[PDB]
């Protein structure tokens, strides 16, 4: 959340920090951990902008 | 060769049940003669159990 | 026809290709070879010192 | 990684004349065929805009060594790569044109594009290790708060072989552990949190061989 | 090596170019998953493509319990389902792993035609799936 | 000095496309040497 939605909440709060929000993340995990659920999940954060 | 699977390929989602199906030690030994010799003409003189051992 | 050099351009009509005339200078492959060599032309009073 | 059109986007601010800063992945269009005159179009565009400077980046998306004369698809590449050949080649000497292309790796060079009179640049980038790392850093957590007692030099002098946008990493992992933290100033701890969140490999080298 | 990893390589280069090429995708972010980590090219792991990296590792025990109960919806059971026996018994099992083990759970509920599902339908359900993945291959990952 | 034909080649790829389709044996380079006899051979390293 605080990777891709945090960043769309409120950018200045980083900029005031200092740093740019984060570019890209990419996730790992051994396989079958089911890391596409947790994209399937973030899904549900705008369901048209996703 | 269940070896050489990608990892990813057993992976409950992909496949879930996993049957390993080994060859017949005694008794389908002989059952996989009679079934195979079904139709084959032979003399009341072979021992399906012996020839299976 | 001999003037006609083989491997080399002529040219051609449209609604029947027939010859129309012919085409100087098209190219050498062996030119465009050491083009993309550039080589370092020099010469032989600008040696340095093996004589 | 360091920072590649980095010092290229640096000459581009800094210079007076009209870029032209091209992925060199760009050059395979739709059409077949098509990429040659593009190719060529870039050159003919820069050579008549002004005396600017244009930059070919990822060189070696153009720039192959060795090419398959069967796929078709590489006959168009190895035929555009010939088209830059002849367009670098097609300078007058008169033209205040100059478009540096870049790559990086090296290793696959094409020795037609870089054969004497085609490129006369060379400038390796090594990773900055204490002359830069202090720079580096320096310049880095120049827009970060660092309130009173993180020490800049206390984490650089660490071995830590690291790469010029790795220190850029570090500074914002620890920034975003701060954004985490709300931390208006950098904390000298955060920088710990961040020297060995970026620094995280696997080396497990033997003491055995010390 | 092939005639398509140039043409491959092309791609991978053109999204990262792209990726902050010259432009900066702002108010948008992309996040991208991977099972091998260690096949990454050096240039994808670089700060300008990959900002921060989060390992997603194996259920803990808490996380298996947790996993179980979600997948634990639709079970018809009997009030003596001891998933904490179970959870001791589910180790080292992969995030799917449970939504499997409650899957066979029915099977084996489905066997006798038994309409609810008793705490030993889990049990052998676990132990099954323990012995299922003996031919597994046991490398998690590697971020460098 | 000698006015000579001066070919030195590196083992490339893009200059096979002048020499021959598949370049199957180094005999390539001879067949644009053999018609112009007045002609050097170079090798780099």
Same mark, same amino acid.
């Given at each position: 959340?605080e990777s891709?939605?945090?960043?769309?909440?409120?950018?200045?709060?980083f900029?005031?920090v200092g740093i740019?929000?984060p570019?890209?993340?990419?996730?790992?995990?051994?396989?079958?951990?089911?890391?596409?659920?947790?994209?399937?999940?973030?899904?549900?954060?705008?369901?048209?902008?996703? | 060769?269940?070896?050489?699977?990608?990892?990813?390929?057993?992976?409950?989602?992909?496949?879930?049940?996993?049957?390993?199906?080994?060859?017949?030690?005694?008794?389908?030994?002989?059952?996989?003669?009679?079934?195979?010799?079904?139709?084959?003409?032979?003399?009341?003189?072979?021992?399906?159990?012996?020839?299976?051992? | 026809?001999?003037?006609?050099?083989?491997?080399?351009?002529?040219?051609?009509?449209?609604?029947?290709?027939?010859?129309?005339?012919?085409?100087?200078?098209?190219?050498?492959?062996?030119?465009?070879?050491?083009?993309?060599?550039?080589?370092?032309?020099?010469?032989?009073?600008?040696?340095?010192?093996?004589? | 990684?360091?920072?590649?059109?980095?010092?290229?986007?640096?000459?581009?601010?800094?210079?007076?004349?009209?870029?032209?800063?091209?992925?060199?992945?760009?050059?395979?269009?739709?059409?077949?065929?098509?990429?040659?005159?593009?190719?060529?179009?870039?050159?003919?565009?820069?050579?008549?805009?002004?005396?600017?400077?244009?930059?070919?980046?990822?060189?070696?998306?153009?720039?192959?060594?060795?090419?398959?004369?069967?796929?078709?698809?590489?006959?168009?590449?190895?035929?555009?790569?010939?088209?830059?050949?002849?367009?670098?080649?097609?300078?007058?000497?008169?033209?205040?044109?100059?478009?540096?292309?870049?790559?990086?790796?090296?290793?696959?060079?094409?020795?037609?594009?870089?054969?004497?009179?085609?490129?006369?640049?060379?400038?390796?980038?090594?990773?900055?290790?204490?002359?830069?790392?202090?720079?580096?850093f320096?310049?880095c957590t120049?827009?970060m708060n660092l309130s009173?007692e993180v020490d800049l030099?206390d984490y650089v002098?660490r071995?830590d072989?690291i790469?010029?946008?790795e220190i850029t990493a570090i500074c914002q992992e620890a920034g975003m552990h701060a954004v985490r933290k709300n931390r208006?100033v950098i904390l000298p701890k955060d920088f710990e949190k961040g020297y060995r969140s970026n620094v995280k490999k696997?080396?497990?080298?033997?003491?055995?061989?010390? | 090596?092939? $005639?398509?990893? !140039?043409?491959? @390589? !092309?791609?991978?280069?053109?999204?990262?170019? @792209?990726?902050?090429?010259?432009? @900066?995708?702002?108010?948008?972010?992309?996040?991208?998953?991977?099972?091998?980590?260690?096949?990454?090219?050096?240039?994808?792991?670089?700060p300008?493509?990959?900002d921060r990296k989060i390992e997603?590792?194996?259920?803990?025990? @808490? $996380?298996?319990?947790?996993?179980?109960?979600?997948?634990?919806?639709?079970?018809?059971?009997?009030?003596?389902?001891?998933?904490?026996?179970?959870?001791?018994?589910?180790?080292?099992?992969?995030?799917?792993?449970?939504?499997?083990?409650?899957?066979?759970?029915?099977?084996?509920?489905?066997?006798?035609?038994?309409?609810?599902?008793?705490?030993?339908?889990?049990?052998?359900?676990?132990?099954?799936?323990?012995?299922?993945?003996?031919?597994?291959?046991?490398?998690?990952?590697?971020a460098? | 000095?000698?006015?000579?034909?001066?070919?030195?080649?590196?083992?490339?790829?893009?200059?096979?496309?002048?020499?021959?389709?598949?370049?199957?044996?180094?005999?390539?380079?001879?067949?644009?040497?053999?018609?112009?006899?007045?002609?050097?051979?170079?090798?780099?390293?």
């Amino acid at each position: 959340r605080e990777s891709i939605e945090l960043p769309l909440m409120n950018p200045e709060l980083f900029i005031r920090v200092g740093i740019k929000p984060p570019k890209g993340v990419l996730l790992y995990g051994p396989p079958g951990t089911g890391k596409t659920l947790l994209a399937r999940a973030i899904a549900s954060n705008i369901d048209a902008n996703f | 060769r269940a070896d050489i699977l990608d990892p990813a390929l057993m992976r409950s989602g992909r496949l879930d049940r996993k049957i390993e199906f080994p060859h017949p030690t005694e008794e389908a030994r002989a059952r996989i003669l009679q079934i195979h010799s079904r139709k084959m003409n032979v003399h009341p003189d072979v021992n399906f159990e012996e020839l299976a051992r | 026809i001999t003037k006609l050099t083989p491997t080399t351009r002529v040219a051609l009509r449209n609604d029947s290709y027939v010859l129309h005339l012919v085409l100087p200078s098209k190219v050498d492959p062996l030119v465009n070879l050491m083009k993309v060599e550039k080589v370092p032309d020099s010469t032989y009073d600008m040696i340095g010192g093996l004589d | 990684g360091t920072g590649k059109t980095m010092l290229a986007k640096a000459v581009a601010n800094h210079t007076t004349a009209a870029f032209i800063r091209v992925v060199g992945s760009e050059f395979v269009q739709k059409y077949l065929g098509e990429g040659p005159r593009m190719v060529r179009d870039v050159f003919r565009l820069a050579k008549e805009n002004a005396p600017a400077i244009i930059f070919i980046d990822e060189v070696d998306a153009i720039a192959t060594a060795r090419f398959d004369a069967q796929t078709g698809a590489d006959r168009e590449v190895q035929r555009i790569l010939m088209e830059l050949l002849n367009q670098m080649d097609g300078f007058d000497q008169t033209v205040n044109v100059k478009v540096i292309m870049a790559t990086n790796r090296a290793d696959t060079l094409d020795p037609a594009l870089l054969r004497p009179g085609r490129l006369d640049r060379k400038i390796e980038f090594p990773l900055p290790d204490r002359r830069q790392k202090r720079l580096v850093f320096q310049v880095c957590t120049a827009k970060m708060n660092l309130s009173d007692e993180v020490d800049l030099e206390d984490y650089v002098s660490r071995p830590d072989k690291i790469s010029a946008a790795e220190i850029t990493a570090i500074c914002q992992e620890a920034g975003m552990h701060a954004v985490r933290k709300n931390r208006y100033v950098i904390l000298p701890k955060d920088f710990e949190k961040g020297y060995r969140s970026n620094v995280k490999k696997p080396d497990t080298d033997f003491d055995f061989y010390k | 090596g092939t $005639s398509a990893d !140039r043409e491959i @390589q !092309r791609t991978l280069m053109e999204l990262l170019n @792209q990726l902050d090429g010259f432009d @900066q995708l702002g108010k948008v972010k992309m996040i991208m998953a991977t099972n091998r980590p260690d096949v990454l090219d050096p240039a994808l792991l670089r700060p300008g493509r990959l900002d921060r990296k989060i390992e997603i590792p194996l259920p803990n025990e @808490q $996380s298996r319990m947790e996993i179980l109960k979600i997948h634990g919806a639709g079970i018809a059971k009997h009030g003596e389902i001891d998933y904490e026996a179970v959870v001791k018994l589910a180790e080292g099992f992969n995030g799917a792993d449970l939504r499997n083990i409650c899957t066979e759970a029915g099977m084996s509920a489905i066997r006798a035609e038994r309409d609810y599902v008793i705490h030993e339908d889990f049990m052998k359900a676990v132990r099954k799936l323990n012995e299922a993945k003996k031919l597994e291959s046991s490398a998690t990952y590697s971020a460098d | 000095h000698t006015d000579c034909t001066f070919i030195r080649v590196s083992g490339s790829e893009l200059v096979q496309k002048y020499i021959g389709e598949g370049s199957r044996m180094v005999r390539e380079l001879f067949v644009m040497a053999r018609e112009h006899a007045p002609s050097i051979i170079f090798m780099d390293e």
